[PDB]
Design a protein around this motif. Structure first.
Motif, short mmCIF file in Angstrom:
data_model
loop_
_atom_site.label_atom_id
_atom_site.label_comp_id
_atom_site.label_asym_id
_atom_site.label_seq_id
_atom_site.Cartn_x
_atom_site.Cartn_y
_atom_site.Cartn_z
N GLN A 119 38.47 39.96 26.39
CA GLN A 119 37.85 41.06 26.43
C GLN A 119 37.57 41.53 27.70
O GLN A 119 38.27 43.01 27.90
N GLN A 120 37.06 41.08 28.73
CA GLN A 120 36.76 41.53 29.82
C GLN A 120 38.04 41.88 30.69
O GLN A 120 38.15 42.86 31.45
N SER A 164 40.32 43.54 29.76
CA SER A 164 40.63 45.03 29.39
C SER A 164 39.75 46.13 29.86
O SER A 164 40.45 47.03 30.37
N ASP A 165 38.50 45.72 30.13
CA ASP A 165 37.36 46.48 30.69
C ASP A 165 37.43 46.45 32.20
O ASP A 165 37.14 47.33 32.94
N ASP A 166 37.92 45.26 32.94
CA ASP A 166 37.77 45.21 34.33
C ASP A 166 39.07 44.22 34.62
O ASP A 166 38.80 42.97 34.63
N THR A 222 38.34 40.31 36.41
CA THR A 222 38.29 39.12 35.58
C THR A 222 39.48 38.15 35.87
O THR A 222 39.20 36.91 35.71
#
Lengths: 252, 253, 252
Positions: free
Chosen positions: C128-129, C131-133, C137
């Motif tokens: 998940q992380q 995709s956000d950073d 990551t």
């Protein structure tokens, strides 16, 4: 000023000086094997690597600038051109050099009368080619140093990567480097070095011709690497380190 | 603490020769004249053996240190059998003193270990006990063990026996320590990273050091197997023994 | 770049395939190939999705091993690091006649805990992380594979250098690899007719000390390095090459 990085924490300091055209990244593969036994000082020489913004200078001056950032006492190890710098420091301030180690270096790179070496005009021509073709002259001079070994391809790439991972140094710094090699001759000045002197060589070294005469520096010791060329610590990292560990012990 | 050391010959290059367990530098009597014009020859009695009396049991490290102390600044070191472990130890500890390493009829790890051919520990242990309880019978057993199987076997064991009978034998303690060196020492990994030339001479019929291809795969060293020699190829085949030493001098320059 | 990049080095007539870990490429072997090219024909692989084999995406562990097999020699020793130890292991299950010996380095049959290991939801986090950073990551996951040693910050920037000098792996492939770690268990399929050498760092955060249970695989051997974390061939080169050279003696 001078890019200087300190690693590890043994009580014996070890200053590592690279050779012409390169930088401290050449020690990446042997620093792990050493940093547990020494405080290690990785130095980009003035004018080289991340120490850009120096031009040409005399060997003496190069040695004064590196000396001005060194620890109080340390083993000094110089590879190739770095071997001359480390030598100059031992000559100028012997109280600072617990021991001198040169790796694939010559006190006098240019062939003199009944002294093996490079033809003074080969090297002089290398300075002209640097004017006409800057980038490719540095790469061709570094290609010379790994030739001849059963490892030449991966070793030439290790050196080539280390010059290409950083912006090229100035062309005046490099030409000055070539001039130091062309004109410097420390054979006599080292005849009576007051500290332990360890000389490491490669048998297939195309720049530093294989030692018996400097052996006849009777207090110094020498090791000849039978299957290495001008960069024994790249092709033979484990044999390279072990005499250094033995040297720390002998000092004690 | 000083070691018996005779320098002979008038040769360009230095050659330290080290005898094996139980013997002495007289084992080289009949190859030294063929080497004398090519090497300055350093004939040594290992600490505790022959003429360097008064040493007891010591580690291979202490043994190699004591020899190196009377050694010339730079030499070629040739070790036979246990002398081979001494010369190897010197190579490892002090590469700056060793122009090149040569071992004859010699193994980095004399006792069999797992996936490693060698003397079985219990066979070595049996030899020890035999030596303790029945000394001179076991000396003869030993001399036969070095020459057995070759065209020349009786004459060669007689030649080795001459070198035994005519000097003081090592003390009970020196004898036991040396067998303990052969029992315990394993220099296999240690010699992978040697910087200098490494030449290994072997006898096809050697019954103490089994027939070599594992060690060749020390890729920088070279090896030579004399089809007809056993554990003393400089006795049984003097002429072929010296040739690779001349070839080595050629390589060193 | 829809091809698996594959480089062969050496003349040691025993073959040795080297498989890197999550995010990395064959450059991570730069400092050990000199130590081993004298003893092996080395095959440096960039896993598909990574390094110079970037033109790939997500794929099952068996898809990866199958793609990697197609260009592998008839027989070889297979050594896998971390995620690469699962590709190696898979290959020594799909086609074991090709594999003279299986070596894993700081790797586990089932990376996610059940059974000590990594919590499954924290491998969900990285996915998940990712995709956000994306960048941090990757950096933070890589940082886990070196921290815990006295050389943690040298070793960490060795790995970042290898990543930054080649195209960044696709988010798809990077997500795919995290999937392999999170989901796969190979504990049962490795109970196996070749010598099985297992290498671990005592200080490894990602791979705990499930060694003593995996020693029970009664005919698998294990070696622990007391001062290594997840990257022991980087932190401790010498102690890493020694068991490889002794394994080669145990064949032939």
């Amino acid at each position: 000023d001078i890019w200087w990085q300190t690693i590890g924490e043994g009580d014996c300091h070890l200053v590592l000086l690279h050779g012409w055209g390169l930088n401290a990244q050449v020690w990446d593969c042997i620093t792990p094997q050493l940093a547990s036994h020494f405080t290690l000082h990785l130095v980009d020489l003035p004018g080289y690597g991340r120490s850009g913004g120096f031009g040409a200078m005399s060997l003496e001056a190069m040695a004064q600038r590196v000396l001005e950032q060194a620890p109080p006492q340390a083993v000094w190890l110089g590879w190739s051109l770095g071997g001359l710098v480390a030598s100059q420091v031992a000559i100028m301030r012997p109280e600072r050099v617990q021991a001198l180690v040169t790796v694939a270096s010559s006190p006098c790179f240019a062939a003199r009368d009944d002294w093996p070496g490079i033809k003074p005009e080969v090297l002089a021509g290398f300075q002209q080619q640097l004017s006409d073709d800057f980038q490719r002259t540095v790469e061709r001079f570094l290609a010379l140093q790994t030739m001849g070994t059963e490892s030449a391809r991966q070793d030439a790439r290790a050196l080539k990567q280390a010059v290409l991972s950083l912006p090229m140094p100035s062309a005046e710094a490099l030409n000055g480097g070539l001039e130091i090699l062309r004109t410097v001759d420390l054979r006599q000045a080292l005849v009576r070095l007051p500290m332990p002197f360890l000389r490491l060589y490669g048998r297939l070294d195309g720049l530093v011709p294989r030692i018996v005469p400097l052996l006849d520096w009777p207090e110094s010791e020498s090791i000849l690497f039978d299957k290495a060329a001008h960069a024994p610590f790249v092709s033979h990292p484990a044999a390279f380190c072990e005499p250094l560990l033995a040297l720390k012990t002998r000092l004690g």
